[PDB]
Design a protein around this nucleic acid. Structure first.
Ligand SMILES: [Mg+2]
Ligand SMILES: [Mg+2]
Ligand SMILES: [Mg+2]
Ligand SMILES: [Mg+2]
Ligand SMILES: [Mg+2]
Ligand SMILES: [Mg+2]
Ligand SMILES: [Mg+2]
Ligand SMILES: [Mg+2]
Ligand SMILES: [Mg+2]
Ligand SMILES: [Mg+2]
Ligand SMILES: [Mg+2]
Ligand SMILES: [Mg+2]
Ligand SMILES: [Mg+2]
Ligand SMILES: [Mg+2]
Ligand SMILES: [Mg+2]
Ligand SMILES: [Mg+2]
Ligand SMILES: [Mg+2]
Ligand SMILES: [Mg+2]
Ligand SMILES: [Mg+2]
Ligand SMILES: [Mg+2]
Ligand SMILES: [Mg+2]
Ligand SMILES: [Mg+2]
Ligand SMILES: [Mg+2]
Ligand SMILES: [Mg+2]
Ligand SMILES: [Mg+2]
Ligand SMILES: [Mg+2]
Ligand SMILES: [Mg+2]
Ligand SMILES: [Mg+2]
Ligand SMILES: [Mg+2]
Ligand SMILES: [Mg+2]
Ligand SMILES: [Mg+2]
Ligand SMILES: [Mg+2]
Ligand SMILES: [Mg+2]
Ligand SMILES: [Mg+2]
Ligand SMILES: [Mg+2]
Ligand SMILES: [Mg+2]
Ligand SMILES: [Mg+2]
Ligand SMILES: [Mg+2]
Ligand SMILES: [Mg+2]
Ligand SMILES: [Mg+2]
Ligand SMILES: [Mg+2]
Ligand SMILES: [Mg+2]
Ligand SMILES: [Mg+2]
Ligand SMILES: [Mg+2]
Ligand SMILES: [Mg+2]
Ligand SMILES: [Mg+2]
Ligand SMILES: [Mg+2]
Ligand SMILES: [Mg+2]
Ligand SMILES: [Mg+2]
Ligand SMILES: [Mg+2]
Ligand SMILES: [Mg+2]
Ligand SMILES: [Mg+2]
Ligand SMILES: [Mg+2]
Ligand SMILES: [Mg+2]
Ligand SMILES: [Mg+2]
Ligand SMILES: [Mg+2]
Ligand SMILES: [Mg+2]
Ligand SMILES: [Mg+2]
Ligand SMILES: [Mg+2]
Ligand SMILES: [Mg+2]
Ligand SMILES: [Mg+2]
Ligand SMILES: [Mg+2]
Ligand SMILES: [Mg+2]
Ligand SMILES: [Mg+2]
Ligand SMILES: [Mg+2]
Ligand SMILES: [Mg+2]
Ligand SMILES: [Mg+2]
Ligand SMILES: [Mg+2]
Ligand SMILES: [Mg+2]
Ligand SMILES: [Mg+2]
Ligand SMILES: [Mg+2]
Ligand SMILES: [Mg+2]
Ligand SMILES: [Mg+2]
Ligand SMILES: [Mg+2]
Ligand SMILES: [Mg+2]
Ligand SMILES: [Mg+2]
Ligand SMILES: [Mg+2]
Ligand SMILES: [Mg+2]
Ligand SMILES: [Mg+2]
Ligand SMILES: [Mg+2]
Ligand SMILES: [Mg+2]
Ligand SMILES: [Mg+2]
Ligand SMILES: [Mg+2]
Ligand SMILES: [Mg+2]
Ligand SMILES: [Mg+2]
Ligand SMILES: [Mg+2]
Lengths: 205, 144
RNA sequence: CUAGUAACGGCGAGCGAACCGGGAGCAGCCCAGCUUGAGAAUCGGGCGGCUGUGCCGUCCGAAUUGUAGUCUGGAGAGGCGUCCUCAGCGACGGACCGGGCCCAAGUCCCCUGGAAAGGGGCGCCUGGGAGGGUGAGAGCCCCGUCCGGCCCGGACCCUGUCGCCCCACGAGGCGCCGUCAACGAGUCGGGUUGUUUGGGAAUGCAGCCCAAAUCGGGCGGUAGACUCCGUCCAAGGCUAAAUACAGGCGAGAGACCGAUAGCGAACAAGUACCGCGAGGGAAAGAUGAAAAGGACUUUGAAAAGAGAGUCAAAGAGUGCUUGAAAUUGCCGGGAGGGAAGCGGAUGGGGGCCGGCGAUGCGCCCCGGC
RNA sequence: GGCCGGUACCCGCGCGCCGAAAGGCGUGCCCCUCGGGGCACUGCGCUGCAACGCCCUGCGGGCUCUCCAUCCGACCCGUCUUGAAACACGGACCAAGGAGUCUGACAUGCGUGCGAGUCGACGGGUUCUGAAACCUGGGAUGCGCAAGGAAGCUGACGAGCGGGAGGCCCUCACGGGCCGCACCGCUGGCCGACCCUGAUCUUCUGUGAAGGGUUCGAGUUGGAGCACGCCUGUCGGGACCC
RNA sequence: UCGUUCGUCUGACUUGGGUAUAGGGGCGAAAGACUAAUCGAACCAUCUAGUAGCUGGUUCCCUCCGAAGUUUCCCUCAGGA
RNA sequence: AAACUUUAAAUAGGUAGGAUGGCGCGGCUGCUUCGGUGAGCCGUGCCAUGGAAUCGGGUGCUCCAAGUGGGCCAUUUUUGGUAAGCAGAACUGGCGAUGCGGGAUGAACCGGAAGCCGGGUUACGGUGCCCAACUGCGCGCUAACCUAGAACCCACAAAGG
RNA sequence: UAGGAGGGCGCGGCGGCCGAUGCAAAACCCGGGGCGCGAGCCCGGGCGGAGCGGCCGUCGGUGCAGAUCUUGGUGGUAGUAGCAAAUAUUCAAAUGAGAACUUUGAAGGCCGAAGAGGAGAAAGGUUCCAUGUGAACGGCACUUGCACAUGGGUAAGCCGAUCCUAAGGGAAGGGGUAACCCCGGCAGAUAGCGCGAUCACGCGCAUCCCCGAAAGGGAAUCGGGUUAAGAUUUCCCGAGCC
RNA sequence: UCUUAAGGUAGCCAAAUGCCUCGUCAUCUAAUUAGUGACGCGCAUGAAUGAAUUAACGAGAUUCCCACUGUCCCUGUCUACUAUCCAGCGAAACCACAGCCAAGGGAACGGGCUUGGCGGAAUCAGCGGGGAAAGAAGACCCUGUUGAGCUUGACUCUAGUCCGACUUUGUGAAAUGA
RNA sequence: GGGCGGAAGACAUUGUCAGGUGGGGAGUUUGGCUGGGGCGGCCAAUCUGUUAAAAGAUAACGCAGGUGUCCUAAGAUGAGC
RNA sequence: AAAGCGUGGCCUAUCGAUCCUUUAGAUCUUCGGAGUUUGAAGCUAGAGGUGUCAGAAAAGUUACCACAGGGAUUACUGGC
RNA sequence: ACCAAGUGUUGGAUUGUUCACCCACCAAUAGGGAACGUGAGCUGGGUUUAGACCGUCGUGAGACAGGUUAGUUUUACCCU
RNA sequence: CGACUCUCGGCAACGGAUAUCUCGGCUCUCGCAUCGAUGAAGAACGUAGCGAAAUGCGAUACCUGGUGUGAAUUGCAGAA
C-alpha cells in the first residue's frame, strides 16, 4: 500500500469468478416477458391486463408515510361496507387482504369509494348464453366491452403542491414555532419524572 | 484502449519501467492493508489519522428511515413560490409554502429573505430560521 | 436500491445482512379435534357387464383403537328471515405443434481464358441483391431468399359462436342475534454443550437435562422485575407465475481461432501408445476443373532411369497448392603465415543503372492551315 | 597561400559624355596652399558575377550493391553488480509461439454533456438487416445541495484589510486617481462539540435581550457538482511470465 | 552386470503356488530397512495457475527531461512505507 | 595533556544594507500607567534620487506519479588497526550514468565533457624509430665490470657507507 | 543508466471513404533502383495462380535474441567412438542376378548329459506348418526368416478343469453407520429341511450357506500305427475299463 | 577439618575408554609414534548403562614368526582379444565466438586487450599440461519472518484413561442428619 | 407349580456434561545487531564528557562512565548565616 | 512587610499506543413502543504494559534431511 | 666470506601423516617454488555423509576441533 | 596452375515457415423436458459377395416392415 489514497476494501478474496453474473440475456428477458404478457392478454381477454383492483395505502416508516401506493387487497370491512361479498370479489376482479387493518377513518373511506367507482364501470358477462341472473348486464353493455389496458385507476402518490395566499394575522406572528418545539420536547423527557413524582404522591400523600 | 497504454511504448526496454535493481516482485510490502501498525504506520498516521480504535457506542439494528430529516434553508423558499402567486399579495397578504410538499422536514436559517412576508409551514425549524422569517414580516406554522 | 451500510472482528487482516422504497409476477387452499347413530352414509379386491383413463351389479374384506360428510380462526355450529346464487353433453371452429410440396428474372452478341462466373454491348427480376453450389468477383445457371399458396397429422382441456337441455326446496351469499365457540405435547419454553451467523448477556441448528400453559402462548435486535402499549397464533399438509440452467436434445448468431491457433481430438481421438493399477495420453488437414493417376519402347534382378503420353500446368506425379530459414551438393568467381567477423577511408575488379544525360526555345523568310 | 560563398535589399547598374575596359570628366565652399585634399545638394527607377572547356550509347559517367586489398580503429552479447572481455551465469543454429492484461473500488489530470442539479444504470413501450436505435418514469433511486456531536440533539442572523490581472477618468506624456476578478496573506462574524453567560418570557423546565472563549470541526461567510470516456497510480483478484 | 576368489549347505535351511496385513498405515532377528528402479512417510488425481521480501526473462524508432544508495519508523538489516 | 586551560586564529556560521521606510493630524481599546502614561491598531494627509558590487525571470504556487533507499574512488581533516586494494566518519568533486585526447595497458589520474560536417587553433601530453611533430639551438652533471638512467597517481626501496 | 513524456513506424479486425487484380492478387526469392536520422516504405525483375491495398475513426490475444524458454527442423562432432564373453571352422557341388552367412555331402570341433539334449507349469497368443515375397525389419549381409502376404492346422465317458475341503474370502436375520460401508457367532420359527414314503403321513433337525488348489484329496486305458502341421493315452487298428 | 543422599566398593587400564601423550619401565628391532607385558592422582574406568574372565568359533580389527613369491631391487619376454588398416554399418556427450606464447594492466591467475616473441597448405597415430574441460540451479557455510523427520521442562490443543453428577433407575428397611 | 438353568443386581454398563491426567498424537514457534554464523556482549529505549575537524549535524562490537531509581522533603517560600 | 517567587527535584537521563480491564468526574447521554428500575453500553481524565523500550502470545535437534537464493557471507588457491 | 645453481642430495624401522625421530651408507645426505605443481595420472591410509562401539556432555532427540571400526574415486573420440 | 578452409552468385537438395482456405473448435442467445426390473447407461461377441477400423445393426444381424419421395447404389461384381 502506498500514496494518500482511500483505504482499499474490495471483497475479492473468495472464488468470486465462479459466481460472476453477466447480463447478456437482458434483451432476451424483455422479449420473453413481452411474449408472456401478450400471451396472457389473449387468454384473459376481455379482462384488463393490469390485474385486479388494488387499494390505496399509506407507506410505512416516517420517510414514506406521506406517500400513497397500491396495497395488496381490500380489507373485509371495506368489502362489506361497499356491499361486495367476501367470496365474490376475487371472481369479479377485486383482490382481498384478510390481514390489513383500518385504524384511521379517512383511509377506510377512500378505499370504499374505489370499490363503488370500480363497481360503476365494471361489466359482467352472464355465466351462460341467455339466462340473466343477478349481477349480469345488458347485451348492449356486453358489445361495447373491450380489453382495457394500462392503469385504469391510477394512484396519486401524494399531495399536490399548492402555494396559496392568505393574510398574516397578529396571532400568527406571535406564535413561537421554535418555543413550541422545545417545550414539547421538554414534556416528553420529563414524562417519567413527572409521573413518578405524581405516582409517589398517592403512595405517600 | 490498448494502443494508448504506456506498456506499448516500453516494448524493447528490458524492465518494462520497473527498474533493474528493485524489480517488479510479487508482494514486497504485504497484501492489502497489511502492516497498518507496523511498516505502514507512517502512512496510516499521516493520511488516515483516526483509523485505529473504537469510539462511541453501538446501535444494534440501525434503520436509516428513523433518522431521515431533509432540510432546506430560508434562502431557497422563494424559488418555491410560483410567479403569479408571488404577484397576488398585499402588505399583509403572503404566500404559504408547505415545504413538506417539496420533500423537506426541517427549515434552516442560512441566507437572506426578501421583504415580502411568507408563511412557512413545516414539521421542524431552527431558532434563526423563524427569527429571519418573522423579521421579514411573515409567520411560521407547525404541522405533522 | 438499502449498502460496502448496522453489525461482527488478535475491533487487526478483514467481513457483512435485513426493514423501508421501486420493479417482474401475483392465488391461495385442506386437514385433526365436541358435533351419522332411526343408519359406515366411506373405501379396496375378485368376478360379470358396458358407454370403458371410468360407471354399474354382486360376493369377500378393510375400518368403530374411526372410513365419509361438516369445520380450519379470515372463522364456524346453531336460530330466524323478504330475499339473492347453482345441471351437461353435442356441432363447428381460432389459436398454438410437427411435416411434405409450389412458387421472379439472360445462361443473347464479341474478346480473353483450360474453364466466363471476367471485360464490353444489349436486356430483364427485385415485398426476392440472406446464404450456398456450379471449372476465376454469378440478382437473372441450380438450390435457396421475399410475398405467400397448398395438402397431411397432431396434441389439445384455452375461448368463439350456434343446439337441446333449464339450475333449489340441498348447499352457499346476505340481514339480525347473542347462547356456544373445541384451534396440533417429551412439543413449546428454559438451562448447558458444540457448531453456525452480521446477530452483539447468545442468529439458526443439534446433543443431553429440566420440562409447560388455555384471562393463554410467541414476538417488539442490551440481560433483569412491574404497569401499560403495538403485534401475531408455532408444534400437521398442499400450492402456479415471475427465477436458475458448462448436462440432454433442437435451433440461431458472432468486431472470436485459422491446423504449434481453436476443445486433448477439423482426420477410424479419449484413438495409437504407456502403466499391475488408480490413471496418463499424442501425432496426423490441402494433386488436379476432371484421375485424364503416366499406355508403349529401351537399360536393369528389381526399385527405378532415359524417351514418350495426359494436363492450362506436371518442374501440380497418390504425404502431390505455395514452398522461407538453418544445413548440404554442383558450376562459376574471389582471398588466405596460430581465428574470423566488425566501424571509417579510398583503390581495384565485378554487377547494375538511359528521368544514367539535352538537343529545345525566342526573332525571323516563305508556303499552308 | 587555404576553406566557404555568388547576390531578389548590402554592395552594384541605367538615367550625360569620353574610354576596350580600369576609370575619368562639373559647380561651390573650407584647407593647407605642391599634391591636391575634405564637405555640399539628391532624385527616379533596376537589381541571381563571369570566361573557356570534357563526354554524350562510349574502353563513358556514378552506385547507397557484391567481392577483394590496404591504413587507422576495434575484446561477446544479454544480466546481477561499486566494478564484466572476464578464470561470473545463460546462449550450437534456424523457423514459429512467447510475458503489465481483464475486472471491481478510489484518486489526480484531461476531454464531452448538462448544471443546483445530474444520472434512465432495475423496468415498461416500441423497434421488420439490429441483442441495435428511439420514447417513458424521479414528487425525492444514487451522488450533490450542510455541518458539528458518542449520543440525546442543535444547525451557519449575511466581512473587512494588504497585495493584485484588467477596465475607466486626468496629464504633452513620463506620473497620478477610481473600481478592483482569481489567487496569496491577515483579522474577524456566524453554526456545532466543550466551557461560560442570563434580561424577559414560560407549560418550572424550557426560552435566550445582552455578553463571551490562548479550546475543538473533514464547518459557514465562494452553491460546483453529477454522468460518461482515456492515461497514470494504489489495492483486491492466477494479476507481467515461468 | 561379468571374471577370479570367497560364506553356507539336515538346518533359526532353500523354494513355487495360495492366502493375510495398506500409507502417519503395514511389516521389520532393527539397517529408518522394505512396502513394484519411488520411502526419515509410496503412488494417482484434485484443491492448484497453492505462496515466494528470492533467481531468470520481459518484444518497434526518434526527440525531450533526467536520478538514488541519504532521513525517520517497522521481528526492521536481500524487504516496505 | 582527546576526555586540562587564562589566551586564541584561518576557514566556515548568523543578522542588516528602505517603497513591507518615516512623519503630522484625530480616533479606538475591555491591555498598561499616578497620569496621554504607554503598547498597539484604525482613518486621513503629506514626504521618501529607489539607498553597496555583480548577476538573473521565478517552485512563485499546486497537483499526480516513477525510479532509488548494496555504492565506490581521489586530494584534505579524521577514528580503530602493525598494516591492508582494511573498517568507520567530515567538506568538495568524480565514477556509477560518459563517450572523446593523454598516462604503453586501467571506472573514478591529467585535459575535457558530445547533434551530422568543412576550415582554423588549442589543453594535457609530446617532437630517434615504432608514432604525427627538431636526431633543433644553449649550459652543466652522469660513465653504471649491479639489466646505468629515463612518466603526477604508479607500480618502493631504509638505516648506513 | 534507472525512470517519465511527446511525436512517429509496423500487425490484425470493425465502421466509413478511395482503389488494385487472370493483360496475373497474396506469400516468397534477388550482386536490381530509390526514399527516410530511424522504425520502415516505394518501385524493378522472378516465382506463384486468386485474392489484396491505402486514408479517417475506432478497437486488440499487436512488434523478440536471450527466459538450463515451448514445439519442430538442422549442423559440427564424424564416416568418428564403435561392431572383441559363451574354443571353429574348411573343401567341393547345387541354387541364384548376386553366396563368407541358404542347401546337400565330406572333414575338423564344441555342449558332455545338474546338457547348448528330450518334455511341462506360469506368461505369451498364432510365434506352429506349407507356399510365395518389392520395400522395410532381422544394428554386416541373405536366395533368407520367430519379418511380410495368402492359406492350413488344436478331435477325449478314460488327460485335465469340473467334485472336496486348507489357510482364508464373501455372506442372509441382527448389530453399528448420515450414508458409502463395517461386523459371523451374536442364535434367529438361522436360511435346506433331510430320510421313509405317494395311494399320506410319519420320523428325525444337534457346530448348518457359498467360494477357495490345472503341485493337496480324487470313477475309469493300454500297446501298435497315422500328419507339411494333431494324438505317448483325443484320430485309425486292436484290446479293456468306469 | 569443610561437606554429601551417598562419596567409585570388588575389579580393570594410556584398554575400541588417557587430554597431556610418541606417558614411564621391560620386551620384540640394526633402528618401532606400531605390538605385547607391567605401572596408575584414571582429562573423562567400574559392576545386568552389567564388572572381570574365558575353551571353541569368526569372509570381524591388530602385532609378530616360518614358508612362499615380479610386491619390490628392475624389468624383460610369451599367448589370446583389442586398439591398428580394409568392406559393410554407424551413435552420443559437448558447442557465445574460438583455439601458440611472455610480461603488464584488468573483477586482484587472459584465447581475445597493451607491448613484445613469432607465424607457411593438407593429413595419420597417440597423450592427458591447459580449455580455472564435461557431468549437477554446492549436499559444506550463511540468508529466508521456506519446510520436513525426531524430541521435550516450548506454546496451544487432542484420542485414551481416572473421577463426580444426572440418566438408565424401580422396590423397602435401619442409624446418624437436618 | 404359566420361572430354561445359574451369578451379580438397581450396583455394573450406556448416554450428556464436569474436573484431572495425557509428546500416545495434532498444529505451531523457537528475535535482531554481529568484520561469516555460533558462543559472548548490547553498541535495540537512553544521559554526560570525548572522538567531532571553534555554528548546527556527524559513524564504528570507538573511548571513560551512567539509567529503569530515590525524596512530605531531597518540593515551595521567607529570614538569618 | 512587600516586590516577587512557586505548574515538583539547580540544568542536562530516570520511561510507554490501539484492544481490554479498572477507577474518578456529571444531580450527563443511550439500551430505538412508552415508563419506573437493577444491569449494561458511552463522553472526559487517570491506573494495570508491552525493557526486542512506535509496543507478536512461543523450546530444542537433524550426520536421515529438503527448497529458494547468496560469492551481499565462512571453510582451499590467488590478491593487498 | 666471495664468484658460483654446472652436477648431486640415498636405503630403511615407527607414524595416514607434512613435520618428527632413530638405524645405516655417503663427497653430502642443503633449503624452497611451480593453483600449499601434479586425482578424466594412480592410490584412498587420513579427513569428509549414511551402519556401529566407548568416554565426557544433555531429561531427551542428539553433540564432540575426543578415541575406534566398515564404507562407489565416472568421461576424452574435440581444440590446443 | 592445383588440394583444403572461408566467402559471393546461379542451379539443385533438405525442411515445412509463410500466404490463401476450412463439413472443426470457442463464445453468446433461444426453444423444449424425454433413462431404468416392460431390464437402462456401460461392457462383450458376432454380422456384408468381396471389410480390418469407424459408422450401423442383432442369428429377421451395414437390416425386416409401414409411410413419404419417385429411378438409383457404386470401389468391383451380380439379380436386375
Ligand atoms: Mg531507458
Ligand atoms: Mg514505472
Ligand atoms: Mg530485470
Ligand atoms: Mg521496490
Ligand atoms: Mg535492494
Ligand atoms: Mg516495491
Ligand atoms: Mg514490532
Ligand atoms: Mg452510498
Ligand atoms: Mg463468512
Ligand atoms: Mg430461381
Ligand atoms: Mg458472361
Ligand atoms: Mg457466390
Ligand atoms: Mg426460387
Ligand atoms: Mg449458539
Ligand atoms: Mg412445500
Ligand atoms: Mg490441435
Ligand atoms: Mg493437441
Ligand atoms: Mg505454374
Ligand atoms: Mg502447382
Ligand atoms: Mg488452386
Ligand atoms: Mg509442393
Ligand atoms: Mg538456404
Ligand atoms: Mg560482488
Ligand atoms: Mg580472471
Ligand atoms: Mg546465478
Ligand atoms: Mg552453456
Ligand atoms: Mg514471432
Ligand atoms: Mg435526484
Ligand atoms: Mg494486477
Ligand atoms: Mg554346495
Ligand atoms: Mg515359500
Ligand atoms: Mg507366499
Ligand atoms: Mg541411524
Ligand atoms: Mg504466475
Ligand atoms: Mg539480489
Ligand atoms: Mg559575518
Ligand atoms: Mg521507497
Ligand atoms: Mg547500479
Ligand atoms: Mg578540425
Ligand atoms: Mg484477435
Ligand atoms: Mg502477446
Ligand atoms: Mg527466435
Ligand atoms: Mg533482450
Ligand atoms: Mg572405426
Ligand atoms: Mg567392446
Ligand atoms: Mg536330477
Ligand atoms: Mg516356422
Ligand atoms: Mg541389416
Ligand atoms: Mg469349489
Ligand atoms: Mg485339483
Ligand atoms: Mg491333484
Ligand atoms: Mg479307436
Ligand atoms: Mg579403586
Ligand atoms: Mg587408564
Ligand atoms: Mg612392523
Ligand atoms: Mg598395554
Ligand atoms: Mg566416570
Ligand atoms: Mg557407563
Ligand atoms: Mg566375520
Ligand atoms: Mg571401416
Ligand atoms: Mg599468458
Ligand atoms: Mg578463456
Ligand atoms: Mg598450420
Ligand atoms: Mg589426434
Ligand atoms: Mg586436460
Ligand atoms: Mg560449462
Ligand atoms: Mg545455488
Ligand atoms: Mg526479515
Ligand atoms: Mg514445522
Ligand atoms: Mg506445555
Ligand atoms: Mg508434536
Ligand atoms: Mg543474525
Ligand atoms: Mg563473528
Ligand atoms: Mg566545524
Ligand atoms: Mg561543533
Ligand atoms: Mg533544592
Ligand atoms: Mg497506559
Ligand atoms: Mg427495544
Ligand atoms: Mg523499536
Ligand atoms: Mg522442528
Ligand atoms: Mg551433527
Ligand atoms: Mg588434473
Ligand atoms: Mg578410508
Ligand atoms: Mg558414519
Ligand atoms: Mg566422533
Ligand atoms: Mg586418453
Amino acid at each position: 500500500v502506498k500514496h494518500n489514497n482511500v483505504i482499499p476494501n474490495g471483497h475479492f478474496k473468495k472464488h468470486w469468478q465462479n459466481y460472476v453474473k453477466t447480463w447478456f440475456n437482458q434483451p432476451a428477458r424483455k422479449q420473453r416477458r413481452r411474449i408472456a404478457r401478450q400471451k396472457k392478454a389473449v387468454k384473459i381477454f376481455p379482462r384488463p391486463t393490469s390485474g385486479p383492483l388494488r387499494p390505496i395505502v399509506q407507506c410505512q416508516t416516517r420517510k414514506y408515510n406521506m406517500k400513497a401506493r397500491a396495497g395488496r387487497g381490500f380489507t373485509l370491512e371495506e368489502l362489506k361496507s361497499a356491499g361486495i361479498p367476501k367470496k365474490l370479489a376475487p371472481t369479479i376482479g377485486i383482490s382481498v387482504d384478510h390481514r390489513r387493518k383500518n385504524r384511521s377513518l379517512e383511509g377506510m373511506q377512500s378505499n370504499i369509494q374505489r370499490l363503488k367507482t370500480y363497481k360503476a364501470k365494471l361489466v359482467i358477462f352472464p355465466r351462460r348464453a341467455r339466462k340473466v341472473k343477478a349481477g349480469d348486464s345488458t347485451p348492449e353493455e356486453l358489445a361495447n366491452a373491450t380489453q382495457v389496458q394500462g392503469d385504469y385507476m391510477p394512484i396519486a402518490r401524494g399531495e399536490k403542491r399548492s402555494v396559496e395566499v392568505v393574510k398574516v394575522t397578529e396571532e400568527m406572528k406571535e406564535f413561537k414555532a421554535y418555543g413550541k418545539l422545545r417545550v414539547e420536547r421538554m414534556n416528553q423527557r420529563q414524562l417519567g419524572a413527572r409521573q413518578k413524582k405524581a405516582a409517589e404522591a398517592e403512595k405517600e400523600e | 484502449t490498448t494502443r494508448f497504454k504506456k506498456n506499448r511504448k516500453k516494448r524493447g526496454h528490458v524492465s518494462a519501467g520497473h527498474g533493474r535493481v528493485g524489480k517488479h516482485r510479487k508482494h514486497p510490502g504485504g497484501r492489502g492493508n497489511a502492516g497498518g501498525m507496523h511498516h505502514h504506520r507512517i502512512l496510516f498516521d499521516k493520511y488516515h489519522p483516526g483509523y485505529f480504535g473504537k469510539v462511541g457506542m453501538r446501535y444494534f439494528h440501525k434503520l436509516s428511515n428513523r433518522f431521515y430529516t431533509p432540510t432546506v434553508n430560508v434562502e431557497r423558499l422563494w424559488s418555491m413560490v410560483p410567479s403569479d402567486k408571488a404577484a397576488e399579495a398585499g402588505g399583509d397578504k403572503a404566500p404559504v409554502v408547505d415545504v413538506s410538499q417539496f420533500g423537506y422536514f426541517k427549515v434552516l436559517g442560512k441566507g437572506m429573505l426578501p421583504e415580502k412576508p411568507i408563511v412557512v409551514k413545516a414539521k421542524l425549524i431552527s431558532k434563526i430560521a423563524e427569527k429571519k422569517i418573522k423579521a421579514a414580516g411573515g409567520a411560521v406554522v407547525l404541522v405533522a
